[PDB]
Amino acid sequence: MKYQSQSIALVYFAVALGLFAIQVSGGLLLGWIYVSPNFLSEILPFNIVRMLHTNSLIVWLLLGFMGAAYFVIPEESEREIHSPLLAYLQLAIMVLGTLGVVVTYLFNLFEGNWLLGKEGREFLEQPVWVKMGIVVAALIFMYNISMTVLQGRKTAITNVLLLGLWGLTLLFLFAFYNPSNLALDKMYWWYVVHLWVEGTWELVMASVLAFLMLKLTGVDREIIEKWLYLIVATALFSGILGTGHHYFWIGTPGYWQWIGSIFSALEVVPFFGMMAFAFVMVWKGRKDHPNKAALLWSLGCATLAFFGAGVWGFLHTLHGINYYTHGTQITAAHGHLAFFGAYVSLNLAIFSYAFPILRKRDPYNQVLNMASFWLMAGGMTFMTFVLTFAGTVQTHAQRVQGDYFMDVQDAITIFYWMRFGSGIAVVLGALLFIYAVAVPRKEII
Amino acid sequence: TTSMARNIFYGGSLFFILIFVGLSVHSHRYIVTTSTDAATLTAEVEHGKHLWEIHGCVNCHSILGEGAYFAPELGNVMTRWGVEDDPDAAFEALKGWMDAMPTGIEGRRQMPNFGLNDEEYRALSDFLLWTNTIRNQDWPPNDAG
Ligand code: HEC
Ligand code: HEM
Ligand code: HEM
Ligand SMILES: [Ca+2]
Ligand SMILES: [Cu+2]
Ligand SMILES: [Fe+3]
Structure with missing residues (x-):
């Protein structure tokens, strides 16, 4: 550490990792319900488990970003954080919020209540008190890190990061606008989901990936920060209009089929940018950094995000294909690999970098940490292959041939067992990473 | 530079x-x-969307191809049931189905029962219908969703 407040990041990572373990176990369960549909079919129905799989994903990824912000800000701003008390109060709000969500979904508390009961759109089912909690927590967060940059050194890393983070926060406000008109509802719903993941969150991914490469390779500011601004340019140029790929079939105008389909293809540019950025910086820079694992997650992140977000994205992004594959298992395959490479791996890469620093010791459990990456990445891409096949069989069987939903699903049972199996790998993988980060032991040879 | x-x-x-x-x-x-037809966006249709929301249909189903991938697309269920031009038959068809869930069938995916009254079934029926009329570039490709 250079600054003592950088250890707040360790509490954030701790909770986030706690929540990461719940998230994949939620996934495994969902997978198992797919092959064994009668399981807990009255106490824990699929839609309940799903909310839990998806929300804990959003919440833990955010805590990852918050944690990462509390680590990366003081280091770049050359000063201590404006107020530790705010950081802890922020995280307490978060933990309270995330507890309320778990307990509300499970037991169906206050069904119907405008403020206390669950809402009901994808990823935005949080009782409105929790949504409020998140905003209050986010604002506190934004105030706190902003003051720390204002009063310290400003750099390109810090700027992109603050933008992405500010944009992320403010776009969350759209989660409050729930128009009685389904088409309108769907249109502003993507302001949250897509302008997060392909907009604001992309800034955060690139700026943190900048900071990573900066430290692991030892290439200098000016080379890193050039590439930074270039990458995030191509992202916002393609990302914002590319929102139109979600505007094909929801009742928006026909013109989005063109705008959207074109700007979508351009979205593979920044994900290629980052993959190459990561690979050159390495080849180009110092190669003896002790933190072998934070390196691997970093390349892993930029690479899988390219295959996940870029290629599999492109694959179903043109309306000609999308007409057929929309709302299908194909969608499920993109989303998993895209989320894993761009955001999970990125959080895991930054966790692997800061844990040793935070514990003041040498990169530890490197073989284990790295084994967790192969096991999670291995199992994750295998899952996405298997769901592509399945989605192809579906798309054909139901969208060209016209066979009925349920019947077609009996046809792809084998693929669902294969996903479930691949899930065992991801869960084992994720636990091992937690272990590797949480329990330093004698290194493996 | x-x-x-x-x-x-x-x-x-x-x-x-x-x-x-x-x-x-x-x-x-x-x-x-x-x-979207503003005139047909009645108080029932709102109440239907709200019911849709609070019971969490989207986390099993998809609507206009958005949601979960566990159960049939319901954006066009009313056309699938040859019942789209008849509001009363739609209501009837929906109530009959929902009253029957869960099937309990071994090895088959399961839908809960939400304890819905008839005013509520009507709300949902009306909303799914109203959804079926959203002019959305001829999606989906056919009746199967
Ligand atoms: C998962 C735990 C479910 C939730 C929540 C909802 N539904 Fe559902 N639904 C589900 C399954 C597995 C099936 C297929 C059942 C079968 O035996 O084939 C369905 C089916 C319907 C249908 C018939 C659609 C069709 O066959 O094409 C309708 C009209 C329907 N479901 C409506 C509906 C509404 C209004 C919901 C929220 C209030 C809802 N479902 C939730 C599983 C699940
Ligand atoms: C951070 C990167 C990205 C992540 C995490 C991500 C994730 C997702 C998720 C989860 C969905 C489904 C949303 C839902 O539940 O309805 C989705 C939809 C989609 N994404 Fe991405 N995405 C990313 C970037 C991209 C890119 C670069 C492309 C390139 C074209 C792309 C193409 C698509 C398409 C076409 C759909 C809609 C699929 C359909 O209509 O069924 N995405 N994305
Ligand atoms: C542990 C293994 C996992 C399994 C078995 C699994 C399984 C599933 C299942 C069954 C769904 C519901 C899909 C549907 O509606 O049909 C789902 C949704 C989702 N999962 Fe996972 N999951 C796993 C891990 C992950 C990971 C690591 C991520 C990324 C963080 C992730 C992100 C998602 C997302 C974003 C959705 C919403 C998908 C959408 O609407 O497109 N899951 N998961
Ligand atoms: Ca979805
Ligand atoms: Cu009503
Ligand atoms: Fe998108």
Whole structure:
């Protein structure tokens, strides 16, 4: 550490990792319900488990970003954080919020209540008190890190990061606008989901990936920060209009089929940018950094995000294909690999970098940490292959041939067992990473 | 050339935000006036959307191809049931189905029962119908969802 407040990041990572373990176990369960549909079919129905799989994903990824912000800000701003008390109060709000969500979904508390009961759109089912909690927590967060940059050194890393983070926060406000008109509802719903993941969150991914490469390779500011601004340019140029790929079939105008389909293809540019950025910086820079694992997650992140977000994205992004594959298992395959490479791996890469620093010791459990990456990445891409096949069989069987939903699903049972199996790998993988980060032991040879 | 890349970024981004906000304002109006029928967006249809929401159908089903992938697309269930032009038969068809869930069938995916009254079934029926009329570029490809 250079600054003592950088250890707040360790509490954030701790909770986030706690929540990461719940998230994949939620996934495994969902997978198992797919092959064994009668399981807990009255106490824990699929839609309940799903909310839990998806929300804990959003919440833990955010805590990852918050944690990462509390680590990366003081280091770049050359000063201590404006107020530790705010950081802890922020995280307490978060933990309270995330507890309320778990307990509300499970037991169906206050069904119907405008403020206390669950809402009901994808990823935005949080009782409105929790949504409020998140905003209050986010604002506190934004105030706190902003003051720390204002009063310290400003750099390109810090700027992109603050933008992405500010944009992320403010776009969350759209989660409050729930128009009685389904088409309108769907249109502003993507302001949250897509302008997060392909907009604001992309800034955060690139700026943190900048900071990573900066430290692991030892290439200098000016080379890193050039590439930074270039990458995030191509992202916002393609990302914002590319929102139109979600505007094909929801009742928006026909013109989005063109705008959207074109700007979508351009979205593979920044994900290629980052993959190459990561690979050159390495080849180009110092190669003896002790933190072998934070390196691997970093390349892993930029690479899988390219295959996940870029290629599999492109694959179903043109309306000609999308007409057929929309709302299908194909969608499920993109989303998993895209989320894993761009955001999970990125959080895991930054966790692997800061844990040793935070514990003041040498990169530890490197073989284990790295084994967790192969096991999670291995199992994750295998899952996405298997769901592509399945989605192809579906798309054909139901969208060209016209066979009925349920019947077609009996046809792809084998693929669902294969996903479930691949899930065992991801869960084992994720636990091992937690272990590797949480329990330093004698290194493996 | 770093300060250039910065300026391309800050400036060229702002450009595309504007275009997007313009485009959205158009699209918002296209939705309200042309692609969805305001007149048929009754109090029941709102109450239907709300029911849809609080019971969490979207986390098993998809609607206009958005949601979960566990159960049939319901954006067009009313057409699938040859019942789209008949509000009373739709209500009847929906009530009959929902009353029957859960099937309990071994090895088959399960839908809960929400304890819905008939005013409520009507709300859902009316909303799914109203959804079926959203002018959305001929999606889906057929009746199967
Ligand atoms: C998962 C735990 C479910 C939730 C929550 C909801 N539904 Fe559902 N639904 C589900 C399954 C597994 C099936 C297929 C059942 C079968 O035996 O084939 C369905 C089916 C319907 C249908 C018939 C659609 C069709 O066959 O094409 C309708 C009209 C329907 N479901 C409506 C509906 C509504 C209004 C819901 C929220 C209030 C809802 N479902 C939730 C599983 C699940
Ligand atoms: C951070 C990167 C990205 C992540 C995490 C991500 C994730 C997702 C998720 C989860 C969905 C489904 C949303 C839902 O539940 O309805 C989705 C939809 C989609 N994404 Fe991405 N995405 C990313 C970037 C991209 C890119 C770069 C492309 C390139 C074209 C792309 C193409 C698509 C398409 C076409 C759909 C809609 C699929 C359909 O209509 O069924 N995405 N994305
Ligand atoms: C542990 C293994 C996992 C399994 C078995 C699994 C399984 C599933 C299942 C069954 C769904 C519901 C899909 C549907 O509606 O049909 C789902 C949704 C989702 N999962 Fe996972 N999951 C796993 C891990 C992950 C991971 C690591 C991520 C990324 C963080 C992730 C992100 C998602 C997302 C974003 C959705 C919403 C998908 C959408 O609407 O497109 N899951 N998961
Ligand atoms: Ca979905
Ligand atoms: Cu009513
Ligand atoms: Fe998108």
